[PDB]
Design an enzyme around this catalytic site. Structure first.
Site, mmCIF file in Angstrom:
data_model
loop_
_atom_site.group_PDB
_atom_site.id
_atom_site.type_symbol
_atom_site.label_atom_id
_atom_site.label_comp_id
_atom_site.label_asym_id
_atom_site.label_seq_id
_atom_site.Cartn_x
_atom_site.Cartn_y
_atom_site.Cartn_z
ATOM 1 N N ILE A 29 0.828 -1.210 0.000
ATOM 2 C CA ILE A 29 0.000 0.000 0.000
ATOM 3 C C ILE A 29 0.852 1.245 0.000
ATOM 4 O O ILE A 29 0.660 2.128 -0.849
ATOM 5 C CB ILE A 29 -0.951 0.042 1.170
ATOM 6 C CG1 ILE A 29 -2.035 -1.001 0.932
ATOM 7 C CG2 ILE A 29 -1.586 1.437 1.272
ATOM 8 C CD1 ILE A 29 -2.930 -1.232 2.094
ATOM 9 N N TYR A 69 3.988 1.479 -0.871
ATOM 10 C CA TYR A 69 4.870 1.647 -2.047
ATOM 11 C C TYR A 69 4.106 2.332 -3.205
ATOM 12 O O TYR A 69 4.566 3.331 -3.789
ATOM 13 C CB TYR A 69 5.446 0.323 -2.563
ATOM 14 C CG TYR A 69 6.509 0.637 -3.554
ATOM 15 C CD1 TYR A 69 7.677 1.266 -3.152
ATOM 16 C CD2 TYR A 69 6.255 0.536 -4.913
ATOM 17 C CE1 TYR A 69 8.636 1.659 -4.084
ATOM 18 C CE2 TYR A 69 7.203 0.925 -5.860
ATOM 19 C CZ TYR A 69 8.387 1.486 -5.443
ATOM 20 O OH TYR A 69 9.308 1.858 -6.388
ATOM 21 N N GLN A 70 2.949 1.762 -3.535
ATOM 22 C CA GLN A 70 2.019 2.372 -4.446
ATOM 23 C C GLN A 70 1.660 3.751 -3.959
ATOM 24 O O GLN A 70 1.473 4.663 -4.730
ATOM 25 C CB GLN A 70 0.794 1.490 -4.578
ATOM 26 C CG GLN A 70 -0.314 2.081 -5.409
ATOM 27 C CD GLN A 70 0.138 2.568 -6.745
ATOM 28 O OE1 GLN A 70 1.059 2.020 -7.364
ATOM 29 N NE2 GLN A 70 -0.498 3.634 -7.201
ATOM 30 N N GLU A 71 1.626 3.932 -2.658
ATOM 31 C CA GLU A 71 1.246 5.225 -2.146
ATOM 32 C C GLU A 71 2.230 6.321 -2.399
ATOM 33 O O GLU A 71 1.882 7.319 -3.017
ATOM 34 C CB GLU A 71 1.035 5.152 -0.636
ATOM 35 C CG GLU A 71 -0.339 4.735 -0.223
ATOM 36 C CD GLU A 71 -1.353 5.787 -0.632
ATOM 37 O OE1 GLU A 71 -0.982 6.678 -1.418
ATOM 38 O OE2 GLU A 71 -2.514 5.743 -0.169
ATOM 39 N N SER A 72 3.454 6.137 -1.920
ATOM 40 C CA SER A 72 4.468 7.198 -1.943
ATOM 41 C C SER A 72 5.850 6.705 -2.377
ATOM 42 O O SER A 72 6.842 7.451 -2.274
ATOM 43 C CB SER A 72 4.601 7.842 -0.595
ATOM 44 O OG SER A 72 5.264 6.940 0.266
#
Ligand SMILES: N[C@@H](CCC(=O)O)C(=O)O
Length: 417
Positions: free
Chosen positions: A270, A272-275
């Protein structure tokens, strides 16, 4: 003491995301209603013809805000404010097909435009000069539909205001501007005529002040236009960041994982995809930190510093697990986790529309493989107009969930056991 504003349900205008109401028009109407010390009540029109119908009955809305092009002249029956945004109409075609250079090259193409829109009228007149031009217009579509239709090649050409393009271009890789068609012009709010300049003058006072105070240019940068969500990185880049970044945070992802009885690697995905595992990352959308939490959401999860990696990781993990905890019991694992990723992005409200829509379609409202097929329909008016909460960019939700699962798979594969 309630300002009624009628608008269009659309991404450049007004829609609901996971945090509630948003959109350029919606914000501009809200900062205006506050300047009047009244409550803002949104009403939405079904199509442009209906909007103006609604504006011109007695007992109807105060004003219409909907990226409307004045064109007008002096029909005193409908009157326009000062402009708050300048735009240009543009012919749009699909990449790898014959790029038209001139108005005459609109003949022979399939064209679709909003029914009752300025642009339909822009084409209507061009048809006198070239009686072979042919085009269709529809009330059951919004501009987001038109661009999809070109992108996917169901139609050759369309005609839209440049701002609509600036916001969406990125979600439609195949579309390209062919040429500007018409002089630059200003967008404006619409009020019924008209004998009392009571209401009109302050709107005009509001817009003039909000132009010099940076508010308009601020909004314009807030929305128009940018790619929040998207981006699967190289398997190369992820492997890189596994060594450069994850070692700093793995500790925190692990403990939050333990603390909340959930797989630490999904929490880490979550993020990694996030920030991209960046505790200082931020967006003009107002999310921030490693788990790209909003302010209201951060406070709600006990995060007193959005930029502290440990806090943001704990609070983001907390947010995800609760969302997953609140889904209908009828949804079982593992789909349940996917629905929660779907809900994390698009909001549970919208996800709910998707499941109802899924059911009515004779599909399984409990199978991620099914609802996932419905989520992209929420960006199609023929469909979302029939839902409770209306438009949502559901295709980007799907990318979100997918991408997150993909990072989760690589992580699992490397960890280990
Ligand atoms: N009038 C629509 C655009 C119509 C079209 O795309 O043909 C708008 O408000 O942006």
């Amino acid at each position: 003491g309630v300002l009624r504003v009628i608008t269009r349900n659309s991404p450049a205008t007004y829609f609901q995301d996971r945090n509630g109401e948003t959109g350029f028009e919606y914000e501009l109407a809200k900062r205006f209603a506050e300047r009047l010390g009244v409550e803002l009540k949104i009403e939405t029109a079904d199509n442009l013809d209906d909007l103006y119908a609604q504006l011109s009955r007695e007992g109807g809305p105060a004003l219409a805000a909907a990226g409307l092009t004045p064109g007008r002249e002096d029909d005193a029956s409908v009157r326009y404010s000062h402009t708050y945004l300048d735009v240009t109409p543009q012919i749009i075609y699909r990449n790898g097909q014959q790029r038209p250079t001139r108005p005459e090259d609109l003949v022979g193409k399939r064209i679709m435009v909003l029914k009752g829109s300025s642009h339909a009228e822009q084409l209507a007149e061009l048809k006198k000069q070239y009686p072979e031009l042919k085009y269709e217009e529809s009330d059951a579509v919004e501009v987001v539909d038109l661009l999809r239709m070109v992108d996917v090649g169901d139609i050759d050409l369309t005609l839209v205001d440049s701002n609509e393009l600036a916001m969406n271009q990125v979600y439609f890789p195949n579309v390209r501007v062919a040429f500007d068609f018409g002089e630059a012009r200003g967008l404006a709010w619409a009020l019924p005529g008209g004998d009392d300049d009571s209401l009109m003058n302050e709107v005009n006072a509001f817009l003039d002040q909000a132009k010099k105070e940076g508010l308009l240019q601020r909004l314009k940068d807030r929305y128009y236009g940018h790619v929040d969500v998207l981006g699967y990185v190289g398997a190369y880049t992820f492997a890189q960041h596994l060594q450069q970044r994850l070692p700093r945070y793995e500790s925190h992802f692990k403990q939050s994982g333990k603390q909340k009885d959930t797989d630490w690697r999904l929490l880490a995905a979550i993020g990694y995809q996030e920030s991209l595992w960046q505790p200082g990352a931020t967006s003009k959308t107002g999310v921030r930190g490693l788990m790209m939490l909003t302010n209201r959401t951060a406070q709600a999860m006990g995060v007193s510093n959005r930029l502290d990696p440990k806090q943001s990781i704990q609070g983001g993990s907390k947010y995800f697990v609760q969302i997953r905890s609140e889904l209908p019991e009828s949804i079982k694992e593992p789909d349940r986790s996917w629905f929660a990723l779907a809900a994390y992005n698009i909001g549970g409200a919208h996800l709910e529309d998707a499941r109802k829509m899924a059911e009515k379609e004779g599909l399984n409202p409990n199978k991620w493989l099914d609802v996932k097929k419905m989520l992209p329909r929420l960006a199609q008016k023929q469909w979302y107009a029939k839902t409770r909460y209306g438009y949502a960019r559901g295709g980007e939700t799907v990318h979100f969930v997918q991408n997150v699962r993909r990072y989760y798979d690589i992580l699992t594969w490397v960890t280990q056991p």
